[PDB]
Design an enzyme around this catalytic site. Structure first.
Site, PDB file in Angstrom:
ATOM      1  N   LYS B   8      17.195  74.475 -29.633  1.00 58.53           N
ATOM      2  CA  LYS B   8      18.347  75.170 -30.203  1.00 58.53           C
ATOM      3  C   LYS B   8      19.504  74.264 -30.615  1.00 58.53           C
ATOM      4  CE  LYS B   8      17.396  79.499 -27.724  1.00 58.53           C
ATOM      5  NZ  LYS B   8      18.127  80.601 -27.037  1.00 58.53           N
ATOM      6  N   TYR B  49      14.623  87.308 -33.495  1.00 58.86           N
ATOM      7  CA  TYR B  49      15.235  88.084 -32.424  1.00 58.86           C
ATOM      8  C   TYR B  49      15.283  89.616 -32.658  1.00 58.86           C
ATOM      9  CZ  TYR B  49      16.452  83.883 -29.926  1.00 58.86           C
ATOM     10  OH  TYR B  49      16.375  82.726 -29.191  1.00 58.86           O
ATOM     11  N   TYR B  57      25.572  91.293 -27.877  1.00 59.22           N
ATOM     12  CA  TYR B  57      25.586  89.861 -28.161  1.00 59.22           C
ATOM     13  C   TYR B  57      24.735  89.426 -29.370  1.00 59.22           C
ATOM     14  CZ  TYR B  57      20.950  90.047 -26.026  1.00 59.22           C
ATOM     15  OH  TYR B  57      19.618  90.315 -25.775  1.00 59.22           O
ATOM     16  N   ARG B  85       7.358  78.835 -19.914  1.00 65.49           N
ATOM     17  CA  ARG B  85       8.444  79.738 -19.526  1.00 65.49           C
ATOM     18  C   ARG B  85       9.017  79.382 -18.148  1.00 65.49           C
ATOM     19  NH1 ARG B  85      11.776  83.414 -22.015  1.00 65.49           N
ATOM     20  NH2 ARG B  85      11.072  85.336 -20.994  1.00 65.49           N
ATOM     21  N   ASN B 112      21.711  77.973 -24.472  1.00 69.63           N
ATOM     22  CA  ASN B 112      20.817  77.650 -23.366  1.00 69.63           C
ATOM     23  C   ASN B 112      19.663  76.766 -23.788  1.00 69.63           C
ATOM     24  OD1 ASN B 112      18.999  79.495 -24.663  1.00 69.63           O
ATOM     25  ND2 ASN B 112      19.856  81.195 -23.449  1.00 69.63           N
ATOM     26  N   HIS B 115      14.274  78.102 -26.680  1.00 69.10           N
ATOM     27  CA  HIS B 115      13.509  79.328 -26.687  1.00 69.10           C
ATOM     28  C   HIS B 115      12.042  79.049 -26.406  1.00 69.10           C
ATOM     29  CE1 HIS B 115      11.900  83.209 -28.032  1.00 69.10           C
ATOM     30  NE2 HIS B 115      10.939  82.469 -28.560  1.00 69.10           N
ATOM     31  N   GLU B 126       6.041  85.255 -33.098  1.00 71.58           N
ATOM     32  CA  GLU B 126       7.028  84.232 -33.426  1.00 71.58           C
ATOM     33  C   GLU B 126       6.393  83.057 -34.144  1.00 71.58           C
ATOM     34  OE1 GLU B 126       8.511  83.525 -29.559  1.00 71.58           O
ATOM     35  OE2 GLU B 126       9.673  85.393 -29.520  1.00 71.58           O
TER      36      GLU B 126
END
Ligand SMILES: Cc1cn([C@H]2C[C@H](O)[C@@H](COP(=O)(O)OP(=O)(O)O)O2)c(=O)[nH]c1=O
Ligand SMILES: Cc1cn([C@H]2C[C@H](O)[C@@H](COP(=O)(O)OP(=O)(O)O)O2)c(=O)[nH]c1=O
Ligand SMILES: Cc1cn([C@H]2C[C@H](O)[C@@H](COP(=O)(O)OP(=O)(O)O)O2)c(=O)[nH]c1=O
Ligand SMILES: Cc1cn([C@H]2C[C@H](O)[C@@H](COP(=O)(O)OP(=O)(O)O)O2)c(=O)[nH]c1=O
Ligand SMILES: Cc1cn([C@H]2C[C@H](O)[C@@H](COP(=O)(O)OP(=O)(O)O)O2)c(=O)[nH]c1=O
Ligand SMILES: Cc1cn([C@H]2C[C@H](O)[C@@H](COP(=O)(O)OP(=O)(O)O)O2)c(=O)[nH]c1=O
Ligand SMILES: [Mg+2]
Ligand SMILES: [Mg+2]
Ligand SMILES: [Mg+2]
Ligand SMILES: [Mg+2]
Ligand SMILES: [Mg+2]
Ligand SMILES: [Mg+2]
Lengths: 133, 132, 133, 132, 132, 132
Positions: B8, B49, B57, B85, B112, B115, B126
């Site tokens: 990110k 998303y 948010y 994960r 964060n 992803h 995705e």
């Protein structure tokens, strides 16, 4: 304020060194402008990339090795990026490369040397246009 | 199995790309494809998303994700999805475990760093987005 | 968005772990607001710092150890800094502390545990006022 | 001998404080005193760089050095001055050696992360500035 | 207290030996003895894993432990056995935590980099096997 | 080609063993054999440093090499001897380069963490001393 072409080489993946390498250039504050991952680079591209070397004894061996595994082509950008990344790279020869350099700390063979970096503005423009038309 | 990873924009802002990719490479996952995006198309982000469209948010999220570069990586390996994960860590700074990418490096619920697909289906999903 | 008080402990200097420790908190994105280096902390300060512990069997031993070498008092700042740094710190007990935490990866004794972190907003305000009047 | 080190604002901007201090700690130098400065008084900076008052860049230098936090550290050890100067690396990005702090981490002649005394005299000098 | 630790052939294959040892060294465990085996005799291996002789994996496990070098180390420290077992992490790549050797670096049930004694019991059997 | 490398008592004292070994491992040198010595017999030491018997430091050097544990390792690779000598760095803390083991980590002429063979000559003497 130039841009240069780097190739993370097949042996980098083999020995799980991709992140270590890239991270060294990243810690030196250079930025990524482009990045392409090749599971197997087309031999044409490899041949062009190394055309200045087409007459040497190691050409066919080098071409074979460059397609023996994945490769990442990166274009970095920074103040005097070309000459600076070439210093991080280290000498092609495992008897020359300084401890501190990518090749000095991590490579032990004249061919399986983890990383390519453009040697000049000319070669850099040329190489960038090959991996990123 | 295969999983989709996003490095990110806050990773590029903090020069943590190698560190993050580093932790996956060491867990012994292979890169199967990778694309660097100097700026991801927004609708790409928004499709990415889609399940979040309804949340408060969701706007700040899409904003953040186009505020800088992004690397989309497809990783491969045994149980890649659940394993990667685990590495990633919890979304909430208040819950992420030390040892994890977010646990050691992230300090914010939105910025964060990384992803990763939450399930087989979202992975297939995705993946075909970032890589058709 | 709080501030917390950390103490890099004498054993951290002894084992050359000061940078490693601080760096973990630094990689977690917390910021330094204050920093003082003590070659030897005044015992008064150490006693205040640990006053809630003044009745325990280990008090006198702990006080002795906290002055057996240098110490750095740091004040960090970040979103929910207090609870987050306490998670990085790890359990006081070498049989409890998780691998991944500062104490879990690096400490092996209940007293020589490298790092102090405020346990609460109250203790944090109090502790900050001690090391930084 | 003793030497004076400045961790520079670009270190805090890139979260490289531990990394830099890290490299000195490992070379086995002891901290004898340390002060964190959220913003160094300017005249302090200017005294610190008094020998540079005449140079074109002297303004951008002082500016940069007050643009963020700074840590002043006095290190101690055998030949601390010359040894820590070797670690530091050359001022010019075009010359700094891989292996050095500036060689590995700095990419700019001004924002070069770390100051260290160049000689015994400058050491005594710079020390009494940051630490009277 | 003492404990036996084996750095396994996959550690050498992936060049993770110093990384594994470094983690234990970091936690302040001290080497009491160490031997490098270019290839362990299978009898030592079967002895070492004698408790396992009736399992489906036994034969593969043993083949693996001879497929490459191994380093046998007796480590010593307060509670070395459980403490190091924690560092080591769960056998199952689906369960071992981030922060542990296997959790960070292993991705397979059998190729898990490290052996560590499970008790004072096996601590002595295993030390006696590798070091008599 | 092969070469003898000693991790010295100061490496154990400062917990730098994995760090030293990791550097050599990183350059793709492979361990052919290794022994941990809780304390080396002084005769092995004097043999090892026999060429040095007439120097002012000889006796102190030897005292030091017995003051703590030592790890003897035979490393193997194309040109291991000069290549590793380079990694090792100059003996003098005033000359060893940043990037080298001693340059990064040593700060003393005698307490220099590592021995490495200087030639095919001493490579065989020294291997024969530590491994017969
Ligand atoms: C000189 C040389 C190069 N090569 C291969 C590996 C090199 O990375 C590649 C290109 O050579 P070159 O441009 O000289 O090296 P560098 O990558 O350091 O710029 O050719 C050999 O295999 N053997 C050799 O003797
Ligand atoms: C839950 C949550 C998520 N987000 C952002 C950050 C998350 O990465 C993203 C999607 O949330 P989610 O999919 O729950 O987290 P993860 O990224 O761990 O799969 O949306 C917020 O900004 N605020 C929130 O409260
Ligand atoms: C509980 C305990 C603490 N101590 C010392 C070390 C602790 O860091 C210090 C303060 O105790 P405490 O606040 O319980 O631990 P922490 O530092 O994890 O918050 O007292 C002992 O020496 N022995 C003990 O049994
Ligand atoms: C030489 C030079 C220095 N500077 C800045 C960065 C230097 O750290 C500082 C003083 O220069 P100098 O003392 O030569 O470098 P060093 O910091 O290595 O001792 O001034 C410039 O901004 N531009 C320049 O051309
Ligand atoms: C449980 C299990 C173990 N093994 C192998 C890997 C283990 O390291 C070894 C002994 O198992 P075990 O003692 O349960 O694991 P640990 O190594 O944590 O002590 O046998 C398998 O190959 N398959 C399996 O299903
Ligand atoms: C030259 C020198 C060496 N020594 C010690 C440290 C050296 O490791 C050892 C042998 O010296 P030498 O073989 O010159 O160094 P190296 O370790 O690089 O081979 O003797 C001293 O104690 N004092 C000295 O002045
Ligand atoms: Mg070239
Ligand atoms: Mg998700
Ligand atoms: Mg407390
Ligand atoms: Mg100067
Ligand atoms: Mg078991
Ligand atoms: Mg010599």
């Amino acid at each position: 304020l130039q841009r240069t072409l780097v190739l993370i080489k097949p042996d980098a993946f083999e020995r799980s060194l991709v992140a270590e390498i890239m991270g060294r250039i990243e810690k030196k504050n250079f930025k990524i402008v482009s990045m392409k991952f090749w599971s197997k680079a087309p031999r044409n591209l490899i041949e062009q990339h190394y055309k200045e070397h087409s007459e040497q004894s190691y050409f066919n061996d080098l071409c074979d090795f460059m397609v023996s595994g994945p490769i990442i082509s990166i274009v970095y950008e920074g103040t005097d990026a070309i000459s600076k990344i070439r210093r991080l790279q280290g000498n092609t020869n495992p008897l020359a490369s300084a401890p501190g350099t990518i090749r000095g700390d991590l490579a032990n063979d004249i061919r399986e040397n983890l990383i390519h970096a453009s040697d000049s503005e000319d070669s850099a423009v040329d190489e960038i246009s090959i991996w990123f038309p």
